[PDB]
Every structure is written in C-alpha cells, then in structure tokens.
Swiss-Prot record, chain B:
The gene is ELP1. This is Elongator complex protein 1. It comes from Homo sapiens (Human). It is linked to Neuropathy, hereditary sensory and autonomic, 3: A form of hereditary sensory and autonomic neuropathy, a genetically and clinically heterogeneous group of disorders characterized by degeneration of dorsal root and autonomic ganglion cells, and by sensory and/or autonomic abnormalities. HSAN3 patients manifest a variety of symptoms such as alacrima, decreased taste, decreased sensitivity to pain and temperature, vasomotor instability, hypoactive or absent deep tendon reflexes, vomiting crises, and gastrointestinal dysfunction. Medulloblastoma: Malignant, invasive embryonal tumor of the cerebellum with a preferential manifestation in children. The chain holds residues 1222 to 1332 of 1332 of the full protein. Belongs to the ELP1/IKA1 family. Homodimer; dimerization promotes ELP1 stability and elongator complex formation. Component of the elongator complex which consists of ELP1, ELP2, ELP3, ELP4, ELP5 and ELP6. Interacts preferentially with MAP3K14/NIK followed by IKK-alpha and IKK-beta. It is found in: Cytoplasm; Nucleus. Component of the elongator complex which is required for multiple tRNA modifications, including mcm5U (5-methoxycarbonylmethyl uridine), mcm5s2U (5-methoxycarbonylmethyl-2-thiouridine), and ncm5U (5-carbamoylmethyl uridine). The elongator complex catalyzes the formation of carboxymethyluridine in the wobble base at position 34 in tRNAs. Regulates the migration and branching of projection neurons in the developing cerebral cortex, through a process depending on alpha-tubulin acetylation. ELP1 binds to tRNA, mediating interaction of the elongator complex with tRNA.
C-alpha cells in the first residue's frame, strides 16, 4: 500500500515486491501478477529464498514461461521441479527437447511397467534428430526384441562399425538380417560418392573414419575393394 | 602460447553440462564463479590474440545457462 | 604388433570372415567379444572377460567399457556409477541409480 505505492511511483519495483512479500500473503497474487506479467519473477526469486511454497510456485511459473518453444533444458528442469516426481506433473519432454526425454527415461519410474509409448516417441524423436543412440536402453526398454533393435539400427545404419548386436549369431544371421548385403550396398554407394566428391578436386573426418571403418569391408571377402575406395582417400592427399 | 590457448577451448560444453548437473543440487553460485572465471580467461586470450598476430577458435561453443546467468 | 590386424584376421584366418577363433591378443572391446561370442567358448557367466575388458579399457581412460560389459555381467552397477563419476558421466550414473534403486548414494559422494 502506502509505502508500496511510493515504491512503484519512483519505480522501486524490487523494493515494492519486497514490501509486498513482507506485508503478507494478501499481496502474493498481485506480487505474482507483477513479477510474471513483466517477467520479473527471476529477480524476485533470486531475492527470495527457497523457504515456502511461493518459491516453488515462482519456479514453476519461470519454467512454464521458459518452456514456450525453448529447447532450453533448464526450462524443462524448472517445470519439472514440481509434479509427481522431479519430472514435472506432465511430460515436460513434450516441449520437444530430447534432453528432457533422456532425463525422463534416465531418472525415476512413471507408473508404466515399460513406458512403451515413451520409448516409441523417444525413438521417433531420435530418428527425427538423426541421433543413433536409440540403439541402447532407449530401444532396449520399449523394443526389447534384439531383432527389432538390430533392424532399427540398420535404418540408423551404424553397422559400418561393428555394433554386432547379434553378437556373431546370437539370434539371427548376417545375410538373413541383410547385414553384409546392406553393408556392401552402403559401402559401394559411399564408394562412388567419394569418387564423385574428389572429381570436383573438411574431408579430414573421412581421413581416418573410413580408414578405420575400412575393416567393415576388410572383415568381409572384398579386401581388394579397400584400395578401390582408398583411391579417393588417396586423392585428397594431394591438395 | 597457442598450445595453451587451444588447451583452454576444449572444456566449453564440459563446463556447460557440469553447470546444470550442479544446478540440480542448486550450486548456482559455484557454477557462476566457474562461468565468470572461464569468461575472464576467454576474454584475456581473445584480446591477446590480435596482439600476437595462429589458430582460429570457434565462436559457436555454448557454455552458459540462463539460470546460471 | 599383436594388435587389431593380427588378432582381427586371426579371428578371420585371413581374408575369410570367421575362418578361425579361440585366439585374442589384447581384446580392444571388439576382437575380445568377437572371439568370445563367435564360436562361444565361455559365456559372461565366465565373467573374467568382463573383468579384463573393464580393467584394460578403463586403464585406457575409457570408463564406458565397464558401463557396457557389467550390464551383461553381475549387478556391480554401483562400481559402474563410480567409474562414470570418475569419467564425469553423470546421467548414466543417474540411470543406474534410478533403475537399480540405489538412491542412498544420490548425494553421498557425487555432490
């Protein structure tokens, strides 16, 4: 009131909200209005101390205001500071941040035996983000099948390094699961692609990567093909 | 000198994720100290770079957090 | 040079993919499991392979070797948590603590 009015007239908004907070809960609705309409809750909570439910309310307001369109992981964390767990009342990963999804799948249970829909959404997001870590507990929780996980890694196409999820015929066959055929297909496509790129003659990433992924072709019978692609890796040597 | 300079730029996202890891336990002050020291050193080498001249560092390394800030 | 090529093509017996087994030099997380699983001699029930892999690669500043093999080995997850913390792998330690319900160690040492 009186002192608070004098504060707001001279723009002592920090002192104004201090007066509101110390003058009782009759001002907490108005104080929250003032701090969140103008996004001043951040300095309010910094001045405030984690000693009441008001602190958590301000934290949740901050998170929800920062959860709009922001992949910012602490926004999800603040929205998650409340809820049934430390993972929000709702699925804060719905904000679209895969890190929030990784946190959800990485801490605490969520009333589902397997969280099957969570795993499917996780795999879908990982595919959309071109991150081939779904071939892990991500697909080992909601896609327990070794065969399905192997397939999904095949679309992920990380077998050029031996992830060998079949562990050398634990469940199924290399040719039957089209492991060697798909490897040959991708290797030959990339084979022609490097020659096409070197036609235009950065590439240092492929300097050793294939030079250590060469084994996926060496481990097969097509050893002669090594040089048959190494030429492109050789070509860029003369820049 | 360039060797030490390149040694300093490697820890950007390491510090970045350590900041949030600490912040779950609400260590925002220690992480803020960390960020401030890293920023001061970054500015020191940034301003010394034209003085010396010679590698070029990347300007798209994220190591700061809004709650940290 | 008892390294990747030697043991590799040993498990290959040359240009053939898998014409030989039962020999590994150092087991750099690939030839080791290739030898063990292909022509399975000893399973991870014979967990000595996991111990050797963990010791070797952790000594090689990897610390993810144990994080993978101990999943197949005994429930020493807590040692894996410790190795992850040493290697700054936080969220994996979080996964282990919240899956194995080892909540007592949530703040004792990591903080």
């Amino acid at each position: 009131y009186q002192r608070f009015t004098i504060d707001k007239y001279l723009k002592r908004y920090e002192k104004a909200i201090g007066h509101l907070s110390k003058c009782g809960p009759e001002y907490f609705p108005e104080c929250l209005n003032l701090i969140k309409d103008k996004n001043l809750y951040n300095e309010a909570l910094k001045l405030y101390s984690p000693s009441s439910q008001q602190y958590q309310d301000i934290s949740i307001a901050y998170g929800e205001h920062l959860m709009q369109e922001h992949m910012y992981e602490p926004a999800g964390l603040m929205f998650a500071r409340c809820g049934a767990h430390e993972k929000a009342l709702s699925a804060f990963l719905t904000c679209g941040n895969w890190k929030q999804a990784l946190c959800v799948a990485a801490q605490l249970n969520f009333t589902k035996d397997q969280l099957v829909g969570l795993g499917r959404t996780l795999a879908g997001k990982l595919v959309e983000q071109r991150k081939h870590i779904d071939a892990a507990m991500v697909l080992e929780e909601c896609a327990q099948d070794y065969e399905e996980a192997v397939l999904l890694l095949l679309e992920g196409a990380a077998w050029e390094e031996a992830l060998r999820l079949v562990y050398k015929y634990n469940r199924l066959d290399i040719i039957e699961t089209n492991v060697k055929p798909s490897i040959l297909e991708a290797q030959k496509n990339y084979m022609a692609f490097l020659d096409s790129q070197t036609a235009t003659f950065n590439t240092e990433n492929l300097k050793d990567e294939v030079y250590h992924i060469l084994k996926v072709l060496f481990l097969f019978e097509f050893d002669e093909q090594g040089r048959e692609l190494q030429k492109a890796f050789e070509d860029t040597l003369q820049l | 000198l360039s060797e030490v300079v390149q040694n300093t730029e490697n820890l950007k996202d390491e510090v970045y994720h350590i900041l949030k890891v600490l912040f779950l336990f609400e260590f925002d002050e220690q992480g803020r100290e960390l960020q401030k020291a890293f920023e001061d050193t970054l500015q020191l080498m940034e301003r010394s770079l034209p003085e010396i001249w010679p590698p070029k560092i990347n300007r798209r390394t994220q190591w700061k957090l809004s709650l940290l800030d």
